[PDB]
Design a protein around this ligand. Structure first.
Ligand code: CU
Ligand code: CU
Ligand code: CU
Ligand code: CU
Ligand code: CU
Ligand code: CU
Ligand code: NA
Ligand code: NA
Lengths: 439, 439
């Protein structure tokens, strides 16, 4: 096959993407070993769905798991009566998700389970795939002529040919695995044929962070989670927290082999030590460095010029309310709170008005990083930690280090009940989620 | 009382020290709190016995403990039929130790239990005291005019008003306590009246090391465990392992307060950690620094000159045998071995000839420091770690860091069966001891 493995793509046909996917235990070969994973469509990752604005998506999910499941269309600003976080599909039953792709939308999204209390084991076991909304901006020559690849960043641990079970410490920290994979492959080689690469990046891990750096090269950020930036932004590295997406241009500077690495990053995970008094919690410290892939540049690379502009970011109306959402932890209990409470699907926590804009100040009073996700209503990050964000783009996950406040501008779009939660999915399963009702 | 607490002294009378001591649980005040310790003579430390060469010692030990006990006359080159490591005194019974102090002897010795398998809890709980053999060398003016003090270095931990029980990790590492005491007092003040101090130092701890340093001052070593050096040796610090003794002169240089500290020292103690894989053993690292006492210098101090010479060290006959004793560990089992075996009181390990000299090469193939002690037969340390020792003096404990070989010259003195063992007494109780028979 191609040197660089990527999920099989399913494209809409005549404006319609109509697909049946089964969620099923499936034996496959991964990373050189045989294992049984839980997959969509028989593969890990699941198939990439590729659509255009105004397409209809009709996706029938057949549940062939031994427990209930559902889908979250992560990042899509659609109705929460479709992207329904409270729906349960029982074992053996099916449900059809049908929606229209919004007109003003572009970027890399993804789909995965969202059945409260069971997300972390289901996502860890292999249930996820990407959704790409292609744009008329993809026709500008500086993007059209780039070589495009999707990179699904997802780690795994195997025991006895199956995904390793969650331990109590995994529920506290979020589970990370020793197999650090790209598109389900272990350290694949990308032999570039063009000097400019357009890489769509997805962190579909439960909890692992990827502090991305390409040896000898900057990255040019052109899209965040939910849409394009206004112009490319040069960065020396790019941190992708669980659930985040980014698109970058890589301008290969000379022939050679360059490693794409996940550099050391300390997200605040904890271990336990006994040194005579004790036992007491102790920081794990930064992750060990990982090589994600080997990038081989072509001969005599001459990259395209960067695009001067991408998409202007919308002018938003003045906001009508400011909200404050404080994140705290009880690590030894593995319980996680928003404003002092754990999720309860019967309780509405915030009530807002469709088509108004809100300012959300989300404050991490814990010691771990927490990547905060809001369904249905993409947001503009204004500042995090008191530092203004250096670009304007739609996001739907924002990472908070210990102590930091993020200030978000949140236009409320579709009416209905939806949720916001930490995207360390173990923390969501363990309570760090609340309910927003938009009317 | 005097600003500097020291154990009460019992002196021989007319050439005879005849004393009844009871080993008993005794309520006392220590470090500002009430506790019940196991004591000799009603005190912690026990009374200091002070004798001269050729004195007779007649000590009746009455056992008022709930378990058997005995005495080891640590460092005295007397008969192992008196200093009998196999003798058991049952609860409520008494035994009289009677011996003559050897003619060619001087220094600081001590007494403590040596009933195999029960040493560590009995010593930790308070059962120990010092024995001083005074010398005609003490009359030379450079020692006579010095101010003399004994410093018994011994730590403790209390729980519920009693010595803290041993945990499994204590049996592996040797138990250290958070109360780091001098003569049973917490950080006492020594207000010096003379400019030269002669300090007798005893490490009577189960396992704690004392890396001794006096602020702003060197120490002048004048005696090791079992006798004088040939001349004073200037040192910037002095490591005293469990069971070791030293005598030093301190020459106070100016008015002021100087701390005597136990500086950080890593003896190889281990803890346990769980960081996601695990649980696995991890080094504790160096001890935290401790202040042992506050030393107040007098006004306008003018120290005496040092003695030019002390005692010539004996010329020993050429040795007739070389022995090799290899120390190893099974830390997770808390088992400790010499040449692959644990102690067995029925098994003789070495057979030597009285009045010959032997070379013992003791090799630490473990990762912890081990302070190796031989009963009855004081030795001359030639080298440790391949470094020649910088002085000649009688020792009876030699500390080995991980990997190090000590080469000892061992004149065999009294006939009979005796033992050698680690003086981390938990390691002796857990097997690191063997039997020497001299005939
Ligand atoms: Cu998600
Ligand atoms: Cu969600
Ligand atoms: Cu979290
Ligand atoms: Cu001893
Ligand atoms: Cu002994
Ligand atoms: Cu030892
Ligand atoms: Na299938
Ligand atoms: Na008593």
């Amino acid at each position: 096959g191609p040197s660089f493995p990527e999920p099989k793509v399913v494209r809409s046909q005549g404006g319609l993407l109509s697909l049946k996917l089964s969620a099923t235990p499936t034996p496959l070969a991964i990373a050189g070993q045989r294992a049984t994973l839980l997959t969509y469509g028989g593969s890990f990752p699941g198939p990439t769905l590729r659509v255009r604005p105004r397409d209809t998506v009709r996706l029938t999910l057949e549940n062939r798991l031994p427990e209930p499941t559902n889908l979250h269309w992560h990042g899509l600003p659609i109705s929460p009566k479709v992207d329904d976080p409270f729906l349960e599909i029982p074992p053996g039953e099916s449900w059809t998700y049908e929606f229209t792709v919004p007109k003003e939308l572009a970027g890399t999204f993804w789909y995965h389970p969202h059945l409260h209390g069971r997300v972390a084991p289901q996502l860890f076991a292999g249930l996820l795939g990407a959704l790409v909304v292609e744009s008329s901006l993809d026709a500008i020559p500086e993007l059209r002529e780039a070589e495009e690849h999707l990179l699904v960043l997802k780690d795994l641990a195997l025991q006895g040919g199956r995904p390793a079970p969650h331990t109590p410490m995994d529920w506290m920290n979020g589970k990370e695995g020793d197999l650090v994979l790209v598109n389900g492959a272990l350290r694949p080689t990308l032999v570039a044929q063009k000097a400019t690469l357009r890489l769509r990046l997805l962190n579909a891990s439960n909890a692992r962070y990827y502090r991305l750096a390409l040896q000898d090269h900057p990255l040019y950020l052109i899209a965040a989670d939910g849409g394009f930036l206004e112009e490319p932004l040069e960065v020396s590295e790019l941190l992708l927290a669980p659930g985040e997406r980014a698109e970058v241009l890589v301008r290969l500077r000379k022939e050679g082999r360059f490693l794409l690495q996940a550099l050391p990053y300390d997200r605040g995970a904890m271990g336990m030590m006994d040194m005579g008094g004790m036992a007491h919690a102790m920081p794990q410290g930064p992750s060990r460095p990982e090589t994600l892939l080997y990038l081989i540049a072509p001969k005599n690379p001459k990259p395209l010029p960067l695009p001067k502009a991408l998409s202007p970011f919308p002018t938003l109306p003045a906001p009508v309310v400011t909200r404050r959402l404080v994140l705290t932890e009880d690590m030894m209990a593995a319980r996680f709170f928003i404003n002092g409470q754990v999720f309860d699907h019967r309780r509405v926590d915030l009530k807002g008005q469709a088509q108004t804009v809100e300012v959300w100040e989300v404050e991490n009073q814990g010691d771990m990083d927490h990547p905060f996700h809001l369904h249905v209503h993409p947001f503009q990050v204004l500042s995090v930690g008191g530092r203004p964000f250096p670009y304007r783009a739609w996001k739907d996950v924002v990472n908070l280090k210990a102590g930091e406040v993020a200030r978000l501008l949140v236009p409320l779009r579709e009416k209905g009940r939806t949720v916001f939660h930490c995207h360390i999915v173990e923390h969501e399963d363990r309570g760090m989620m609340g309910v927003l009702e938009v009317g």
